[PDB]
Amino acid sequence: ATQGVFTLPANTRFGVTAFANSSATQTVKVLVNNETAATFTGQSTNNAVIGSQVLNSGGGGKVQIQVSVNGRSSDLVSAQVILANELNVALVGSEDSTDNDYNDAVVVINWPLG
Amino acid sequence: ATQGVFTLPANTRFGVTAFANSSATQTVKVLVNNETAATFTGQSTNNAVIGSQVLNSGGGGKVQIQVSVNGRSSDLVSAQVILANELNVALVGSEDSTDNDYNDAVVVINWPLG
Amino acid sequence: ATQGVFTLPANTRFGVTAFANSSATQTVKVLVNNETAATFTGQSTNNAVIGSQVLNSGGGGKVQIQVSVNGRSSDLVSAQVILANELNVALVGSEDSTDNDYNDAVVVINWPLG
Amino acid sequence: ATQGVFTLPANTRFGVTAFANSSATQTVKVLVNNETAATFTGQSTNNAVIGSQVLNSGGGGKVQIQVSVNGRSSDLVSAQVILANELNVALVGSEDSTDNDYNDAVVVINWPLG
Ligand SMILES: *[C@@]1(O[C@@H]2[C@@H](O)[C@@H](O)O[C@H](CO)[C@@H]2O)O[C@H](CO)[C@@H](O[C@@H]2O[C@@H](C)[C@@H](O)[C@@H](O)[C@@H]2O)[C@H](O[C@@H]2O[C@H](CO)[C@H](O)[C@H](O)[C@H]2O)[C@H]1NC(C)=O
Ligand SMILES: CC(=O)N[C@H]1[C@H](O[C@@H]2[C@@H](O)[C@@H](O)O[C@H](CO)[C@@H]2O)O[C@H](CO)[C@@H](O[C@@H]2O[C@@H](C)[C@@H](O)[C@@H](O)[C@@H]2O)[C@@H]1O[C@@H]1O[C@H](CO)[C@H](O)[C@H](O)[C@H]1O
Ligand SMILES: CC(=O)N[C@H]1[C@H](O[C@@H]2[C@@H](O)[C@H](O)O[C@H](CO)[C@@H]2O)O[C@H](CO)[C@@H](O[C@@H]2O[C@@H](C)[C@@H](O)[C@@H](O)[C@@H]2O)[C@@H]1O[C@@H]1O[C@H](CO)[C@H](O)[C@H](O)[C@H]1O
Ligand SMILES: CC(=O)N[C@@H]1[C@@H](O[C@@H]2O[C@H](CO)[C@H](O)[C@H](O)[C@H]2O)[C@H](O[C@@H]2O[C@@H](C)[C@@H](O)[C@@H](O)[C@@H]2O)[C@@H](CO)O[C@H]1O
Ligand SMILES: [Ca+2]
Ligand SMILES: [Ca+2]
Ligand SMILES: [Ca+2]
Ligand SMILES: [Ca+2]
Ligand SMILES: [Ca+2]
Ligand SMILES: [Ca+2]
Ligand SMILES: [Ca+2]
Ligand SMILES: [Ca+2]
Secondary structure: OOOOEEEOOOOOEEEEEEEEOOOOOEEEEEEEOOEEEEEEEEOOOOOEEEEEEEEEOOOOOEEEEEEEEOOEEOEEEEEEEEEOOOEEEEEEEEEOOOOOOOEOEEEEEEEOOO | OOOOEEEOOOOOEEEEEEEEEEEEEEEEEEEEOOEEEEEEEEEEEEEEEEEEEEEEOOOOOEEEEEEEEOOEEOEEEEEEEEEOOOEEEEEEEEEOOOOOOOEOEEEEEEEOOO | OOOOEEEOOOOOEEEEEEEEEEEEEEEEEEEEOOEEEEEEEEEEEEEEEEEEEEEEOOOOOEEEEEEEEOOEEOEEEEEEEEEOOOEEEEEEEEEOOOOOOOEOEEEEEEEOOO | OOOOEEEOOOOOEEEEEEEEOOOOOEEEEEEEOOEEEEEEEEOOOOOEEEEEEEEEOOOOOEEEEEEEEOOEEOEEEEEEEEEOOOEEEEEEEEEOOOOOOOEOEEEEEEEOOO
16 A cells, blocks of 8 residues: 555644654655655664654645655555544654664654644 | 553663643653653644653653643543554643643654664 | 544444453443434453444534443543545443453444445 | 554454455455464455454464455555553555555454453
């Protein structure tokens, strides 16, 4: 299945944060309605925050996360959870190699804000 | 039910990060095996990171998140998700008031690291 | 926090299924827009299905699960998961006593159907 | 990423239940520590239960779900959630065609029982 794609309510502010855990530099692209809205780049094997920003889901509500390491697309896994019928958290793990920890870049998207 | 309490594998590094979305200053306490291991304090209505740290689950593996606003405990909601049978993300939402967005402080615990 | 309440898309068929794991007879009430739409009753300590039905979310979309044992409300925990950005599963655990396994009645709500 | 694979605590009873939502007959295989422990077969477009059984995770704790339709592997998505730090629900969605509802067979694994 396609992974890393989430439908948000239209015109809604959301947070996106990425963490790195890999010897390789991670490039995390955040596409909102098929346009790049943010790109986080960084290298850490200690869960450093490599980007954290507030974006707007726009008219189409489509948010997609892509992760690559020196031009090679990482394998993604993702899900969305809703807590108290209100707090939405979408999650993306990514694997740049063969050990399958899926933590090489970890991306958290949350809404609503404020 | 009790919320914000999670059992981790023993002696495992984990990340804990908190975001704020409230006019009130949030205090997030992280207890590892019933002792305070970190405290984050901060204010944002725009999902700012108010703390992000690497901790160790220790012998007992017990992690508890408590959130308060000027000494009053916030109500919590929480869940843990596992992706690719390996990537663990424990989530806490908290509510300091009456609107029930549960985003006043949002806490993300993730493991494994590295 | 309130638990066992979920917003579904309006006028959408959904499945609701309950499993029992308790010496006590479980009563599971499914409220759709604040009116009882189904009630399951049954006893098992082996995860037997005590009810499974298809319902319609109606105009309001509001689905609430309540669990009781001979008139006494069990304590509930819940969350909703979305997989492949399309498959929705809402989950309710319940505790009728003191051991906090939260499995005494387990309720699964899923959509879309068909 | 591989989907439909879950690590359970060793020697623990768990439930596995499958629902069908497709014009095609679904075959769900449950492998426990790499050996076939159950197979459910059925056809429904109305979320009927096509199998529900209690199994034991054995020494290794490895549970894998495979879904096929007339010999062809369906595409899977999955996740595990833990509620109240104790109730575990692993979920599998599957797609046998092109509409990507991922509900064609839906599999719920839960523990602990009793
Ligand atoms: C691996 O190196 C390979 C090279 O061996 C070669 O195959 O060329 C490829 C590029 O095509 C790689 O450069 O690179 C991985 C990152 O791309 C790296 O794994 C990642 O970082 C690790 C620290 C860890 O976080 C892992 O999850 C990440 O995917 C891998 O590092 C090694 O991973 C091992 C487990 O398989 C083990 O942890 C080693 O400690 C760690 O160094 C890396 N392997 C090597 C040998 O360089
Ligand atoms: C000794 C006993 O039967 N305990 C069960 C409990 O009984 C009380 C009874 O002692 C008296 O106080 O009246 C109460 C109602 O007013 C109640 O009947 O009833 C519990 C549920 O109502 C029951 O626990 C449930 O069933 C279990 C088998 C298990 O699935 C539990 O998770 C579930 O909540 C008590 O059963 C015992 O529970 C303990 C754990 O606390 C062990 O599982 C024992 O083996 C059970 O017999
Ligand atoms: C037209 C179509 O897509 N038909 C069903 C499809 O039939 C295939 C047949 O056209 C082709 O030549 O042979 C292949 C096997 O080699 C199929 O037999 O088969 C799939 C299941 O294999 C059906 O889709 C399933 O059942 C549906 C009712 C629904 O639950 C869907 O999610 C599921 O995957 C196809 O059924 C059609 O699906 C469409 C949506 O794509 C609508 O739901 C139609 O009403 C339905 O008939
Ligand atoms: C009247 C007042 O001072 N209310 C404070 C809350 O702020 C208002 O919340 C309401 C919603 O209830 C609404 O958003 C207003 O615009 C706010 O001024 C405040 O709530 C907390 O901060 C909010 C900005 C919002 O994030 C909310 O979810 C959060 O709980 C609480 C905090 O203690 O104080 C109230 O006195
Ligand atoms: Ca890796
Ligand atoms: Ca890694
Ligand atoms: Ca609030
Ligand atoms: Ca808020
Ligand atoms: Ca119980
Ligand atoms: Ca029980
Ligand atoms: Ca389908
Ligand atoms: Ca279908």
